[PDB]
Amino acid sequence: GTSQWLRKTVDSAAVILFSKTTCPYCKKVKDVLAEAKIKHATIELDQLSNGSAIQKCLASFSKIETVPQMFVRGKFIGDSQTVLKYYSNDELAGIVNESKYDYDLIVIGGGSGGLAAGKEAAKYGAKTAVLDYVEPTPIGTTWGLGGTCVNVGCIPKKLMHQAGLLSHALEDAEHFGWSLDRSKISHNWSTMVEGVQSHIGSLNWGYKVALRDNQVTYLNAKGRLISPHEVQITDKNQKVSTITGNKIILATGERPKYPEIPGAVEYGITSDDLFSLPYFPGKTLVIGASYVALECAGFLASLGGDVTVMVRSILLRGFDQQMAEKVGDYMENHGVKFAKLCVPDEIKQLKVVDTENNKPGLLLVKGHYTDGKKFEEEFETVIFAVGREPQLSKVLCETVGVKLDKNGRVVCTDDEQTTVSNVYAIGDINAGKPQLTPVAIQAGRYLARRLFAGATELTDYSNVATTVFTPLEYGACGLSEEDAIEKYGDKDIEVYHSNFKPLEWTVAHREDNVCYMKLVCRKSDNMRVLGLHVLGPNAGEITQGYAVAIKMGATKADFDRTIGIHPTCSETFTTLHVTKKSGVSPIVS
Amino acid sequence: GTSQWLRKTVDSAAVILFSKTTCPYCKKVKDVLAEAKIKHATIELDQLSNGSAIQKCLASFSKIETVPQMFVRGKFIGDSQTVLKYYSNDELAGIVNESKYDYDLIVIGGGSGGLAAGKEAAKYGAKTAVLDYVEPTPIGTTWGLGGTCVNVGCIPKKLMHQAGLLSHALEDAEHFGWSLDRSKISHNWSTMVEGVQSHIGSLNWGYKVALRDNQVTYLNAKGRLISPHEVQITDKNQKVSTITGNKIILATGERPKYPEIPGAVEYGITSDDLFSLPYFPGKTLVIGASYVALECAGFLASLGGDVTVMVRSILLRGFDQQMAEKVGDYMENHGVKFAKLCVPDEIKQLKVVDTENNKPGLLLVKGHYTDGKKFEEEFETVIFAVGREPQLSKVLCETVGVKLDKNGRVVCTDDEQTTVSNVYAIGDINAGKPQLTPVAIQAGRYLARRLFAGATELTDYSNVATTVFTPLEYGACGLSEEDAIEKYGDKDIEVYHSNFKPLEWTVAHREDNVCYMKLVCRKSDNMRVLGLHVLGPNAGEITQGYAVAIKMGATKADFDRTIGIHPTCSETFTTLHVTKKSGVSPIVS
Ligand SMILES: Cc1cc2nc3c(=O)[nH]c(=O)nc-3n(C[C@H](O)[C@H](O)[C@H](O)COP(=O)(O)OP(=O)(O)OC[C@H]3O[C@@H](n4cnc5c(N)ncnc54)[C@H](O)[C@@H]3O)c2cc1C
Ligand SMILES: Cc1cc2nc3c(=O)[nH]c(=O)nc-3n(C[C@H](O)[C@H](O)[C@H](O)COP(=O)(O)OP(=O)(O)OC[C@H]3O[C@@H](n4cnc5c(N)ncnc54)[C@H](O)[C@@H]3O)c2cc1C
Numbered sequence A, B: 001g002t003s004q005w006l007r008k009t010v011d012s013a014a015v016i017l018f019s020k021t022t023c024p025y026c027k028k029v030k031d032v033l034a035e036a037k038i039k040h041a042t043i044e045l046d047q048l049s050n051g052s053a054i055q056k057c058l059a060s061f062s063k064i065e066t067v068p069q070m071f072v073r074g075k076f077i078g079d080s081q082t083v084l085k086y087y088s089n090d091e092l093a094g095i096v097n098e099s100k101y102d103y104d105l106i107v108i109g110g111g112s113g114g115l116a117a118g119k120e121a122a123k124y125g126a127k128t129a130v131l132d133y134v135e136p137t138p139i140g141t142t143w144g145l146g147g148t149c150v151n152v153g154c155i156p157k158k159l160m161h162q163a164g165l166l167s168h169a170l171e172d173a174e175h176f177g178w179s180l181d182r183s184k185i186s187h188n189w190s191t192m193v194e195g196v197q198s199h200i201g202s203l204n205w206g207y208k209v210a211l212r213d214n215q216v217t218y219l220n221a222k223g224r225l226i227s228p229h230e231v232q233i234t235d236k237n238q239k240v241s242t243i244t245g246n247k248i249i250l251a252t253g254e255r256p257k258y259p260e261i262p263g264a265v266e267y268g269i270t271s272d273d274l275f276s277l278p279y280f281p282g283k284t285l286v287i288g289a290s291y292v293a294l295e296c297a298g299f300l301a302s303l304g305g306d307v308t309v310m311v312r313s314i315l316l317r318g319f320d321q322q323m324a325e326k327v328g329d330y331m332e333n334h335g336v337k338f339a340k341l342c343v344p345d346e347i348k349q350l351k352v353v354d355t356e357n358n359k360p361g362l363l364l365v366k367g368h369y370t371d372g373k374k375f376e377e378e379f380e381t382v383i384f385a386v387g388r389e390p391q392l393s394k395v396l397c398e399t400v401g402v403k404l405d406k407n408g409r410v411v412c413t414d415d416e417q418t419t420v421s422n423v424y425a426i427g428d429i430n431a432g433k434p435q436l437t438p439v440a441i442q443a444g445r446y447l448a449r450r451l452f453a454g455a456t457e458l459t460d461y462s463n464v465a466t467t468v469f470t471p472l473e474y475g476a477c478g479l480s481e482e483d484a485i486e487k488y489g490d491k492d493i494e495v496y497h498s499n500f501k502p503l504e505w506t507v508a509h510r511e512d513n514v515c516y517m518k519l520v521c522r523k524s525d526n527m528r529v530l531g532l533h534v535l536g537p538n539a540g541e542i543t544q545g546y547a548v549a550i551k552m553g554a555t556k557a558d559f560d561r562t563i564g565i566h567p568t569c570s571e572t573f574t575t576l577h578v579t580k581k582s583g584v585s586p587i588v589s
């Protein structure tokens, strides 16, 4: 293992120093490198149990077993005397910059994964380029650096969710003694969008500054991988050039799908357009039943919108269906209409968007229900939320030899390596991985450390917690109840559950027995918690800490022995006792 | 162990059935007991690794080793034939009700611990009485069943905190696009108190119904333990009688202290009076620096109050002092005034409370600073928050033989047993234990199960998480940084930390680099997390789940391997990297 590790580490590191913490010669090299502004990885052999074995293996590359040893791009450069020789002769700059390639790393895609990977790689002296380009939506929407989450995903969706939550805060404030005339209070969509877009603008700028401050080259250019080490770039002026890189990270993400019906591309919008929409959507139809569809429907209804969701089959396919039903029931009871078992056939235009006075157009949506009844209703805005897909050319990928699956996603090893050994894929294009921002960031930063700092830690994609930011939020970590029963059998599954009522909801006259949580446990494995599920306010804050306990193998007894914090929603997890097998109601007084 | 356990279990259980899950004779006894409405504990010997040993030990009490075996108050009553004989002869009711004592359990105190203990004991057929009496405050305030938390603690404090948070929600709503004229919005104290008191009233009633539905006797009476098994009760009419009990649970809690200065008792109030105060406090002085003092000052300031806190030395003594400073700094920057290194000398009355128009009086407070300067300022309300103390007669406790410490709290074994072996103490009077509602409830329910259902599980009082519901909340679990350094030495402690900014605060134009979290870790124990600390919104929701991971022995690597939920405040715990030893700033972009 030690020999294989050392060979890979030496081959891939841009600039790396083998050192010991107590080694004055090591300190002298560190001081020279720091004076010369040369960034590098450092491995302290006296902080590794196999450090003595590593020292002996180093002689296979350098012919010495002493520290310090400095390497550049797979070549031993010297001990302390040799490094100080290069410095004193003004040779050291030329040596640490010598490469077959323009860059140690080229990241194609400046989103959650690619910016994380690029910034982290640059810290170890990898000469890094990040390419980002935002192909416009069909109506011409575009945005700045930072990817889906920053511009058209997690950040603006959660801000618009917060504007929706503040609706309920205005209602609650009267019950808690605040004197306000709600009959005279309205929401202004464009004022909210201006706020959200000013924050996004601060992130676009922040990322450009962060790349500049890490000596990363940012190119606003479309990248195409044309051979293992060569990236063709096309700038805004349609000027084409080629740059070369040692390691390549594909981090190009996905874009919204459209249904293949007349009028969809011409008259509908997607989440890409919604978060900067210059006009209030008005009476809205959301087609789809993903977390995006329900999140978007939810905040638009809480901002005073007339909202309908058109659902082909079920809500939140792949999530726990009991929890998905409760999420949708809350929405239907709080102002969202559902056209269930219904699909669209055509969108017709009745009015064009007013691009001068910022008002929506008008659309006729024709569809049909499974019962044979026609759907025909006017909406001001139609939002498709029917899935996202990667944008890689299947032909070009095959030419370079990067394997894709039938969905067009990249087939990777558990260390993000593609079938082209210097090329890696992270984030939403990595086939089979949870499509989440913190996953892409951990994958990118951990990969950068393996490539350029001799790290071994892999990303753990198991039991990744999530939250759906519907009007009543849904947090989960681990298996759905149905998936646990399919895997282990009904006889080996115990489910503990309870309704609960936030204290905040009492004086506000909100519902009893609507917030709900459950633990899905394995009887034969000491009642191991396989799945945790919570429907309630602040569900992401609730869920996150339990994700650490589940990663560690938490059992029901671990939950029971922990004392609650009172008064909280989360403390209910520490006192669950009603099982589903008992048939006793989970409702509470 | 098995023999000692069985003897204690048989001696203390009111009604207990030794059974096996697959035992038709056992089912017949269960069916008779259920028909006769006889509640009991059940131990299924085939669900215990030492069940076969227990069966053999049972013959020391019953002369048989078969199941079922039924016991009442330490006496073997019969196998299946004998129990059906008693039933068929109408003798079984008289047998299961025969005792030397009126009650199996008398709980003195109907608060967090005592109601938890009493309800749980009654489930196993313990004939239970709960005594509760609320001695009026000096101004005559009293309230109903449920104890400090329900009436004058956690429940109303967190509701008034929520009313305060909704102030900030009104401010935030304008930035998120809501059109409201804040210059015309005011708070009505009495409307909020009416809401809070209607919820408390629903809990007072709920508890009385819950005790009735568990066949618990509720006496609104002051109890005094006059011998190990005899409780003298004094009813509202000053009528005195004696009831007897097998087990006694002392669960009498604490009441606020007053400083020994002129005017304090006559003109000041405490948290006991604040939560039902019929008039707005108006310009308020809070004397003290406990979590109660700061929680109360905090919500009164957010409800438009002119509030000053008079601090003798430090804030939140016994909490992490870095975190206490940040808590107080946030308050001082958001409308709370602090009179630091100051003590009161006298309260003089300037105006009497208007009990007809619900307005406060007026008070002159005279005190002094450590620098020798006089304090002399008028306030409408003066709230003392200078500590709480138990109310047990030191003389009577000595007469029965219940040992108290120098603070008047009860000295208990790790199973809540006092120096009088049938008498137990739970909750705030249990010397050395965290004074928290969920602690009292877990202690009471776990004790009831040991007394009456043969349970062995003890309450774990280690690493109990807390939250201070100041305007910016502070959640913690485990050691303060200073206490970790005192225990293990500075060289063995590593502290990871970061500022952070809630996404909710961006568009709302709230502060960068004010919310803050840290992990206090032990270097020599695999970077074991000794203490977790977070200052930010929803800090109780954030902290609770990590308390399970800390109970399980979480390390920094456990935190790092877990993936964040985005966008949340809690996810910052999964990506901490800045150490205090590095000297690198914890501020973030
Ligand atoms: C509406 C919505 C809400 C979401 N909410 C959440 C949430 O709350 N929490 C969460 O964790 N996740 C959420 N997600 C998922 C999250 O946005 C993604 O998992 C994350 O953005 C994926 O990051 P990535 O680096 O794979 O790609 P992206 O962030 O999509 O970045 C890829 C970038 O590469 C660019 N690019 C594409 N092709 C090229 C090319 N040839 N050359 C150069 N650049 C190119 C793209 O235009 C883009 O800028 C949400 C997604 C959406 C759509
Ligand atoms: C302002 C404030 C805020 C708090 N906030 C929180 C918080 O947010 N979270 C938290 O976990 N904890 C909080 N606490 C602590 C919590 O209230 C206590 O830890 C908890 O109430 C203790 O329960 P207990 O059963 O020991 O006693 P108590 O709840 O005090 O109940 C004891 C009862 O016995 C009665 N009694 C006394 N003597 C006799 C007698 N001789 N005969 C009969 N009855 C008698 C008392 O009047 C009372 O009704 C707070 C406390 C205060 C004061």
Ligand SMILES: COc1nc2ccccc2nc1CCC(=O)O
Residues within 6 Å of the ligand: A289, A312, A313, A314, A317
């Ligand atoms: C994963 O996407 C789907 N998978 C399915 C599998 C089996 C049957 C139907 C399915 N429908 C969808 C996507 C749209 C929908 O939820 O109806």
Ligand SMILES: COc1nc2ccccc2nc1CCC(=O)O
Residues within 6 Å of the ligand: B289, B312, B313, B314, B317
């Ligand atoms: C625990 O209560 C205190 N302990 C102290 C110990 C040593 C020195 C002073 C102390 N003061 C208080 C209570 C009031 C205060 O915080 O000043």
Ligand SMILES: [K+]
Residues within 6 Å of the ligand: A559, A560, A561, A562, A563, A564, A574, A575, B442
């Ligand atoms: K518990």
Ligand SMILES: [K+]
Residues within 6 Å of the ligand: A442, B559, B560, B561, B562, B563, B564, B574, B575
């Ligand atoms: K992490």
